[PDB]
Amino acid sequence: STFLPAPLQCGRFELTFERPLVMGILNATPARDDALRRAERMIAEGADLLDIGGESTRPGAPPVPLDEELARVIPLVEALRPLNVPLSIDTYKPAVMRAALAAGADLINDIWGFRQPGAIDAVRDGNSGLCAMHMLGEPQTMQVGEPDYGDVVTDVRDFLAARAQALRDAGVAAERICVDPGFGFGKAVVDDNYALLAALPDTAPARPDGRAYPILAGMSRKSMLGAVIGGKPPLERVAASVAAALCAVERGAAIVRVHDVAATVDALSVWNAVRAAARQR
Amino acid sequence: TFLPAPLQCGRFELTFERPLVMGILNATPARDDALRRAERMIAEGADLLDIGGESTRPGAPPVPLDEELARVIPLVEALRPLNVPLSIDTYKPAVMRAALAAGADLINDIWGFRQPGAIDAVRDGNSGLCAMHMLGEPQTMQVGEPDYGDVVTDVRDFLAARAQALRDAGVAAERICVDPGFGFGKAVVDDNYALLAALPDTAPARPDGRAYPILAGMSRKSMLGAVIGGKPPLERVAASVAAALCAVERGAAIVRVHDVAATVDALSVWNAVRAAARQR
Ligand SMILES: Nc1nc2c(c(=O)[nH]1)N=C(CNc1ccc(C(=O)O)cc1)CN2
Ligand SMILES: Nc1nc2c(c(=O)[nH]1)N=C(CNc1ccc(C(=O)O)cc1)CN2
Ligand SMILES: [Cl-]
Ligand SMILES: [Cl-]
């Protein structure tokens, strides 16, 4: 406060964060026209980016075969490109990264932090945005591991610092990179996730210009929320998800990744109005 | 971490380790529909219930005394056994008198105990008292056009005078909370959002040096519609949650809301964040 996240080069777009941006989650997982209507609705509700995922990229989910992931993701990229809204791709598979970038996606959002063999090579060229997330696990297994940290905030920051360095060593400009602490990925459901949310600014390492890498935060409908509201199921977590998104932007998040776009946008309109009033004092 | 000063509140001593949620119980048509609503809001996590028999809002037509009493008193009598603080949203001294005699715990007055006879009605006993700021003329009960130097300072100075008037009549400072009165004589965005941004500065000091605890009510109000493209009241729930969270972040003791479950859930997240912060 009154913090300004560093800019993100994001394929066709140069994102700046005078206000935090809302990334609407477009799960392309049961048809195509169903997903396109969803995307149009989310844009109408105020989504600033769309995150296209052909898999369940969460802990304990079945891993989708390559041909099918390609068949879900690529035609949505092609159909949504004309809308001139950033298209993020939720994938850790280098082949999906290559095909999706060739199809004209703007951002690669990777739960494995570009650790899968060949992912860095897939993304090093061009201008796409890249979100390196923290997940505790061994990449070869494709499985999230058990929580284990000294200070989870420090460990998450150092890992993200190493991932940004690895991207930069391969020629990726620092301005194309954002980071994400990976809420719900190898974290104690309450203690680790809320430590990371309370200390969000400190999860982000510094770019060479001294500015912190901008932060993407995704908590929407997650177990960390169910755990504090008496165990209600995902569809009953909207108000809690709005609360978490607001907390993240209060703590300097550049982008919030959400299911409930209208509700998040409305909440962020109120947040911006408060900030605008505070700036006159 | 801010800890709002405690509120002596009739049968209850309220302390604010966490902010409390006051559920709005609009008792306007019946006297039984209101009761199931109250039970639901308690089940959803309401810490207080605000019983209102009128429209205590700018431009709203008034309800005659005997009708307001017919709506409020049976509800006080019916809800007392539930053992949750009962607040009465009234500016009428006769309703204040009758509600306290029926056993209400808190009097919530949009006129800041300015109506003739109000202070005299609430002097005695241990009821909590919420003195709200509204810019207007008590005699005609008309809200005024916004007019402030620094609205934050003007609101605080008014609330200091109302607290002092209550104390001059023998009211213990511990019984008093204050409310900047969002949407009552305020520029819809300029003034309301200044007050929310500078919320802790709207409360004057008690004699012990702690600020009077703050009640804030923004649920579904125009200030919210104004910033979300002019959506109507029933479509302001997400914006109302954001406002409540902002208010507690800025030290509010009680938030007054229509959407109890949604607000309680948001505050559960907020509490979890604070608890994590306190371990660092
Ligand atoms: N950059 C980025 N990408 C994602 C994220 C995320 O948080 N950040 N979350 C995702 C959803 N995965 C889940 C993880 C945990 C939970 C849960 O805790 O319930 C649910 C879903 C997938 N893709
Ligand atoms: N202590 C306290 N009591 C109240 C309050 C309130 O904000 N604080 N609001 C009330 C509802 N009045 C409205 C005022 C403004 C608006 C609006 O701006 O839309 C709507 C309703 C009545 N009772
Ligand atoms: Cl835990
Ligand atoms: Cl205005």
Author numbering:
A (entry chain B): 2 to 31, 42 to 292
B (entry chain A): 3 to 31, 42 to 292
Question: What does the study report here?
Answer:
Dihydropteroate synthase (DHPS, EC: 2.5.1.15) catalyses the reaction of 6-hydroxymethyl-7,8-dihydropterin-pyrophosphate with p-aminobenzoic acid (p-ABA) to yield 7,8-dihydropteroate and pyrophosphate. In so doing the enzyme supports the biosynthesis of folate, a key metabolite required to support the synthesis of DNA, and proteins. BcDHPS displays a triosephosphate isomerase (TIM)-barrel fold, consisting of eight parallel β-strands surrounded by eight α-helices. The DHPS active site is formed entirely within a single subunit.
